[PDB]
Amino acid sequence: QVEEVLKWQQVEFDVPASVLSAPDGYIPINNIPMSGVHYKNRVFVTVPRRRWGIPSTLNVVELEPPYPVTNPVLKPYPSFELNELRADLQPDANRLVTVYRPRVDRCDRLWFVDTGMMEIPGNFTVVQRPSIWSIDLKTNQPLSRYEIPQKDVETGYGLTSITLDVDPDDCSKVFVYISDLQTYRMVVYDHENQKSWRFLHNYFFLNPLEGDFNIQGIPFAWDDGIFSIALSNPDPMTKFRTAYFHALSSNSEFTVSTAVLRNETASKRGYHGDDFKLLGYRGAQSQSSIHGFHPETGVIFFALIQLNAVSCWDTRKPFAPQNMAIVYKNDRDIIYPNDLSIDQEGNVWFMSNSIIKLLYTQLSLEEFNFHIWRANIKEIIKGTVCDPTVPPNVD
Amino acid sequence: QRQVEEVLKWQQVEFDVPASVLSAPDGYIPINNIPMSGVHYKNRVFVTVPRRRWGIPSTLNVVELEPPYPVTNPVLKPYPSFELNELRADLQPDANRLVTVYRPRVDRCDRLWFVDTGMMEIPGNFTVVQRPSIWSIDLKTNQPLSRYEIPQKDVETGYGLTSITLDVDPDDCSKVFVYISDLQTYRMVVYDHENQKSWRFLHNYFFLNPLEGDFNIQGIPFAWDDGIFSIALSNPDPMTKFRTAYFHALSSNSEFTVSTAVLRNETASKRGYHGDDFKLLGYRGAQSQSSIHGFHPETGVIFFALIQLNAVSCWDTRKPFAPQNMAIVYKNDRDIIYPNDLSIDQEGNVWFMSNSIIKLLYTQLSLEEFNFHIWRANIKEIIKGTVCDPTVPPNVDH
Amino acid sequence: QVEEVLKWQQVEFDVPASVLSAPDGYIPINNIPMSGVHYKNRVFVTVPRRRWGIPSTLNVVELEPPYPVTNPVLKPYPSFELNELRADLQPDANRLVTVYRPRVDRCDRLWFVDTGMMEIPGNFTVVQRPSIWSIDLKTNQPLSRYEIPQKDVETGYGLTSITLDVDPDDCSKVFVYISDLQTYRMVVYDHENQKSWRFLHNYFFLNPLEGDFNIQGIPFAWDDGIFSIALSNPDPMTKFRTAYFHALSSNSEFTVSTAVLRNETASKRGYHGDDFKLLGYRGAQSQSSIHGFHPETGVIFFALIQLNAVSCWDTRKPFAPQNMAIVYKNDRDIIYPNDLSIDQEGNVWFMSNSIIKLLYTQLSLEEFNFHIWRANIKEIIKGTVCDPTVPPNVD
Amino acid sequence: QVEEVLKWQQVEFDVPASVLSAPDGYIPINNIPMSGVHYKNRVFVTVPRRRWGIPSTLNVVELEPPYPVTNPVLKPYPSFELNELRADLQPDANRLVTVYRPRVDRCDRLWFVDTGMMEIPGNFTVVQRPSIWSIDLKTNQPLSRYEIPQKDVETGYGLTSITLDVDPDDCSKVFVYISDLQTYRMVVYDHENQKSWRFLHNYFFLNPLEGDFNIQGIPFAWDDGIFSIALSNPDPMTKFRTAYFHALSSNSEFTVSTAVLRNETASKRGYHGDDFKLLGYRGAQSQSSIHGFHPETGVIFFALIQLNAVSCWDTRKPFAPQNMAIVYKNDRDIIYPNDLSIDQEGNVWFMSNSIIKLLYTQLSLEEFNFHIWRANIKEIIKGTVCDPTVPPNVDH
Ligand SMILES: *[C@@H]1O[C@H](CO[C@@H]2O[C@@H](C)[C@@H](O)[C@@H](O)[C@@H]2O)[C@@H](O)[C@H](O[C@@H]2O[C@H](CO)[C@@H](O[C@@H]3O[C@@H](C)[C@@H](O)[C@@H](O)[C@@H]3O)[C@H](O)[C@H]2NC(C)=O)[C@H]1NC(C)=O
Ligand SMILES: *[C@@H]1O[C@H](CO)[C@@H](O[C@H]2O[C@H](CO)[C@@H](O)[C@H](O)[C@@H]2O)[C@H](O)[C@H]1NC(C)=O
Ligand SMILES: *[C@@H]1O[C@H](CO[C@@H]2O[C@@H](C)[C@@H](O)[C@@H](O)[C@@H]2O)[C@@H](O)[C@H](O)[C@H]1NC(C)=O
Ligand SMILES: *[C@H]1O[C@H](CO)[C@@H](O)[C@H](O)[C@H]1NC(C)=O
Ligand SMILES: NCCc1ccc(O)c(O)c1
Ligand SMILES: NCCc1ccc(O)c(O)c1
Ligand SMILES: NCCc1ccc(O)c(O)c1
Ligand SMILES: NCCc1ccc(O)c(O)c1
Ligand SMILES: [Ca+2]
Ligand SMILES: [Ca+2]
Ligand SMILES: [Ca+2]
Ligand SMILES: [Ca+2]
Ligand SMILES: [Ca+2]
Ligand SMILES: [Ca+2]
Ligand SMILES: [Ca+2]
Structure with a gap:
């Protein structure tokens, strides 16, 4: 019902031996994949440069059964010329420094944010400003690039997540919502008018008491803020x-x-009033990393961090724990769900990268650390409370 | 509880009506007169006595407020006149007379709205005098403005038309919609005032919950099968209106x-399947069965009249609908037997009433004790500091 | 183990051609069979007049291998003279207007209720008051006919199900419990004394949230209340x-x-108190239409509407989903299980009539729309949880 | 029993006219006092440089009847030489740029932190690095100055509150805890060993839902974190x-x-574990700005922002709303309680500067905008639940 598609012990790259032979040109343990997205028969894996020895930040893998695919070699996408890291570390609009979590739209385009910053412990290296890319997945040729001005974000330290808002009619009308979990803000990007603005709000901050975890018997505490954004279907009357x-x-x-988020004048306000609302409580130890909204079913899938699981919620039902169901739970493999995406085929994709083991313990490249799963949405929610046909609980 | 005033109170209800009507046999019975309403306008309070039995001289009445409070055993004066409240012995349909009126509503336009069921629900002999009709009375002149007979296509008799909710346009006042709650046939009948048309909605959510229909008030057990009873309207959405x-x-x-975009849609009413248009908000709480509730435009707070808990609770509509995001503003197990009505005036007060209907139906009703109570509470003051206060933030589980 | 016995693409009647040739005397699409019962290797099929062009409401079919028998012609029972429809539409005590679900007892008698009402969309026509019938199945001669008084039920709109309570000794001592899913009540009928009374309770109502269905991708909601009643064996002590x-x-x-249902004075109460009990939750999407109790095994067979299946339960085990088993499931054929009955031969009979396709979509007369199955009870429950010898999954 | 000591319509300085005449030297409405602290008939009033036109940041006022003293002229302390702002805006270790809330200890010293930064709307000007000062109140001569290294704090943007931890025996043994409500951290200062370290923790952050205020009909929302710290009495041995x-x-x-805070090794941890604890919920609309702990009675006094009041709490009774009492409330005068302090004379001092009026509306220099009160602690709590002799209202 939920099949493991890709798994790695460590990450290898399809690049010249010149890069592998060079000193500090490739360190296996430093290469941690932070995203896995699906399109056609292609899965894009991203390796953010949070360490030294990372040949390519944006990569791609060709799917071929049987699953699970064992240690697929990452091919630098679109090309290694773009994923080449300059030794001088100087700004270049035709290079990719660090890419976290890309998203695929209905227009056969790949959207991602190049932070232009390497978060090496000790040496925070800001190579260039953050930029928002779009790639034509049909030609594999970059379509647009937008450098984010200083007035919106300083460095792009926390720009690790984006949400696409594409008009159902015109494919040119696109808005992108970037979540900064470091600076506790939301960067809005108007693709049509090539403008951008930032939203500051208290709700983007963490809950002090709900920031402590214990995964794989490893205790830790994070102060990370807004991390994920999920969009519902357009309102029929309001659009x-x-x-x-x-x-x-x-x-x-x-x-x-989104009427507020698409309002640039609203961003500059010091007080946003009652525009931002509290939905409700997701549940005890129900801290989510990434979540996505399925347009067909209207079901939001949450990547639960502490519970090592993936849950779902039918947006029509009241937002409560008893109106949510766990569709998959794997305490052995799912250490930290680093990404969750919904593809154009009606599947839910989620990933674990065992980042906790690297941060607070030793990661062993003998074990399969990196996992990617997929599950048919309509089939996974069939019996559950997430099924729109199933009524909500009485509690 | 220490800032809620009792305004009116009765042991027995009497009437300022001709002695010829009071003297006549079965023209007035003391124990049969049970008021089901208490609404405030300016300096007077409109009390209704539905003819659920015999000996009911008048249904729609009015009382002038005058200290001291509470006013003991006020005489109910037929409104607008006794000529409209006089029941015909022949029991023929009277297009200019009032048979049975339950729960009136007052709007901002100085009008009084109510529904004349035209039906007397006497135990043993159900009498349908006429068809159900909606009224509008000018409170300045005390003259009826309009009367609309509800077609058979919408309601059969009007047996359960004991609740009304007004939807007046914020801009114009001639544009009015009325939503009537039928707790007997389990439906909502919609009335378009300007176009003088009406239609009905049928849905499963208008029904009761089989398990949540048992009560025990004042040590008197009972079960009711009553469905949709009360409707409360929020402020117009700034974008959709x-x-x-x-x-x-x-x-x-x-x-x-x-x-209301669905309710105001006549073509949508005639559908067999309404889809996801009607949604479940959430669980109000254990033993939190409500009779009548009202929404205060200014604060955006909903006051529920809790039947089993013999109390009145409030809820800020901005906050998620949850038990911990609700507070009890008033509780009175002694006086509040059954909260029969709850209304929100134009003066920023919440009015609620108990009529001890249970003690008439299932036990003995004593005219020696006070059985009917009307209360008033300032909304902004009663919520100030509570979770009902919009300025106060919502709570969480942990 | 479970074999299809009868199946129709449409239903035809063996009656004078004069009736079929008459103006709108027979419309193929309007005739929907609502039941199928087995007695002495005979099958009685009923076609309630919920439309125009329905020659006969009560019919019978002779069983003869091989099965399934394709498109058997319905034979009016007991005769066409009774099933004839009067043009003047006046009440006739010796005629059958609308019959839903007949039942067979151990005393070789056929019980059914004539509603005397035609539920045509546009013109609800009440021909006559509802009447309960008894037929001697050995002589095919009517035994008894009782008109239900207005004090008990008004129109007989929702009298579409009956349960027989015959004394294990005397065949004259008979009580019949009717289920009114429209007015939300239960009509009790005392055969011996020729009296009857009604019961009103909250538990006869539906559950607002549990009224939405989606069968064959067709969404719809029903407000139908008490629909079926099943009687256990007499208690050895109180009988x-x-x-x-x-x-x-x-x-x-x-x-x-039944001590309460047989109690006329308890009928007149406004509050029944603690007399009616909640048994428990049958399961998610486990809404049932008709169910029967098998005296020998003490097992109840439920006709699941949403699951398109037939389940069983051992009454001795606690009423829980885990203590129930699905004995037959057929998403292709079973759209709506309109009837389920337990014959005298130790078989469970169930039927699907594709009613929803008529109401919400269009019914194709080129496909088989009406199905009747039979299954040996002792053999179907053998290796399940419904087997009395097998212990429960949940104490 | 609570008396108003000082009240201003606007702040004026005792400085040469050459400074007040200077271009953008003295803009009245930009001068907002942020602290009023007491010492032997002297009140130290600070005026942080959050805008242009502020002659002196650290000032003093001599107390003399009758009270309340109307529009006292601020006198630069310890002198105008130190409070004078350089026109070239270059770093100078003998200059005071911006001081927020000074604190007085038992050893007759005045502690405060010069942020060295002007938080001017538009262009935040960082003149110099933040420094921790101590002044002898007997000689009015600066005792010590310690520049806080970049390893601990970036600029000193949010260093607006300090808490003194002086050893009961030796006056030379001092720790200072600085609350940074902007970078959500606590800076520890070792005075004896002239070192310092920072602390990061989730608890220093705000509560998203509890950040919305409505004072004087003025709606606003703040994201400010750890803002105040109060210290209980020291353990008789481990201190x-x-x-x-x-x-x-x-x-x-x-x-x-303090065993944790005084532990430099513990500051460099990425996970502090259960060392920081949640005490409890203070009550609805009970957001506090500054609070202090009175050694004698053991009572903490909270400055309530939303309730326009000052509440107390006995540190022996369980921390719960019904175990706390409002000792003073004033919706008219108390707009934003900007500071609260406890003196060595057993009084509680609190102040309101109407900061929100300047921020979101207009400030009238015809109205009294700045207020400073005092109250005897043991007298104000006498009957209340804050009295140690009075039993708690709930067991919790
Ligand atoms: C884009 O957002 C702009 C700023 O945000 C608005 O103002 C806030 C105070 C809130 O009202 C918020 O909901 C709203 O988005 C805004 O320029 C613009 O329209 C605003 O919509 C306001 C809705 O109330 C409305 O405000 C008006 O002005 C303020 C100063 C007060 O006087 C209000 O009583 C008055 O209604 C106004 O249309 C406008 N507000 C402002 C500040 O300009 C919004 N875009 C669109 C298309 O509406
Ligand atoms: C009244 O109800 C009908 C219900 O069918 C609404 O109809 C439909 O609207 C969309 C597009 O407008 C159409 O695709 C479907 O047939 C919907 O059901 C109708 O809009 C509504 N009328 C109004 C304006 O309230
Ligand atoms: C900061 O960076 C220095 C540069 O070192 C080199 O950087 C790139 C080119 C990699 O190849 C790396 O492996 C090289 O060492 C480091 O020498 C220095 O140690 C770094 N400082 C810290 C504190 O991490
Ligand atoms: C505090 O600092 C570290 C952190 O726990 C620890 O090693 C040390 O023992 C503690 N206290 C001291 C200084 O002994
Ligand atoms: N993915 C780890 C990001 C992180 C987590 C906790 C922190 O305190 C922090 O500064 C950064
Ligand atoms: N307030 C009495 C309304 C009521 C309650 C239960 C019933 O069964 C009924 O017909 C009517
Ligand atoms: N099963 C058909 C009977 C039925 C179903 C639903 C209804 O709403 C209704 O009035 C009648
Ligand atoms: N004067 C209070 C400081 C403050 C409050 C809220 C903010 O969002 C902010 O940036 C600064
Ligand atoms: Ca694919
Ligand atoms: Ca962080
Ligand atoms: Ca009044
Ligand atoms: Ca009822
Ligand atoms: Ca047989
Ligand atoms: Ca029905
Ligand atoms: Ca801040």
């Missing part, structure tokens, strides 16, 4: 969408109309 | 919502 | 029986002693 | 104390032993 968002270190979900 | 209709059944601990 | 009843739109099962 | 701390936008109080 606007409801943005479900939450902080990493939070058991609470919040909502806001 | 529509409202959210909070509605619940009497025998249910659940609250539901629906956009 | 009273447990009446298991449920609403159509509900996942909950209820119980009440 | 460790309990540090009661809270964020500005929070209805929760938190505790931590």
